[PDB]
Amino acid sequence: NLVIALHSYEPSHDGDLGFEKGEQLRILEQSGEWWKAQSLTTGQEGFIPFNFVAKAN
């Protein structure tokens, strides 16, 4: 369930995870406009804009 960001992210909401453009995050939960992703480079867990990441394809 891993994805890849398409734009530099800057956590604004509480309990959010910040990532970079093209970065990867292992989606823990994808329920709601805000998906829970677990980074893979850092692994930092947090929430992320469901409309910010796309499958690492």
Curated annotation (Swiss-Prot):
Post-translational modification: Dephosphorylated by PTPRC/CD45. Myristoylation is required prior to palmitoylation.
Annotated localization: Cell membrane; Cytoplasm, Cytosol
Tissue specificity statement from the Swiss-Prot or TrEMBL entry: Expressed specifically in lymphoid cells.
Modification Phosphoserine occurs at: S39
Limits of the SH3 domain: 1-57
Covalent cross-link (Glycyl lysine isopeptide (Lys-Gly) (interchain with G-Cter in ubiquitin)), residues: K36
Illness the protein is tied to: A chromosomal aberration involving LCK is found in leukemias. Translocation t(1;7)(p34;q34) with TCRB. Immunodeficiency 22: A primary immunodeficiency characterized by T-cell dysfunction. Affected individuals present with lymphopenia, recurrent infections, severe diarrhea, and failure to thrive.
Family, per entry: Belongs to the protein kinase superfamily. Tyr protein kinase family. SRC subfamily.
Description of how the protein assembles with itself and partners: Binds to the cytoplasmic domain of cell surface receptors, such as AXL, CD2, CD4, CD5, CD8, CD44, CD45 and CD122. Also binds to effector molecules, such as PI4K, VAV1, RASA1, FYB1 and to other protein kinases including CDK1, RAF1, ZAP70 and SYK. Binds to phosphatidylinositol 3'-kinase (PI3K) from T-lymphocytes through its SH3 domain and to the tyrosine phosphorylated form of KHDRBS1/p70 through its SH2 domain. This interaction inhibits its tyrosine-kinase activity. Interacts with SQSTM1. Interacts with phosphorylated LIME1. Interacts with CBLB and PTPRH. Interacts with RUNX3.
Domain topic, free-text comment: The SH2 domain mediates interaction with SQSTM1.
Purpose: Non-receptor tyrosine-protein kinase that plays an essential role in the selection and maturation of developing T-cells in the thymus and in the function of mature T-cells. Plays a key role in T-cell antigen receptor (TCR)-linked signal transduction pathways. Constitutively associated with the cytoplasmic portions of the CD4 and CD8 surface receptors.
Stated name of the protein: Tyrosine-protein kinase Lck
Residues of the full protein shown: 64 to 120 of 509
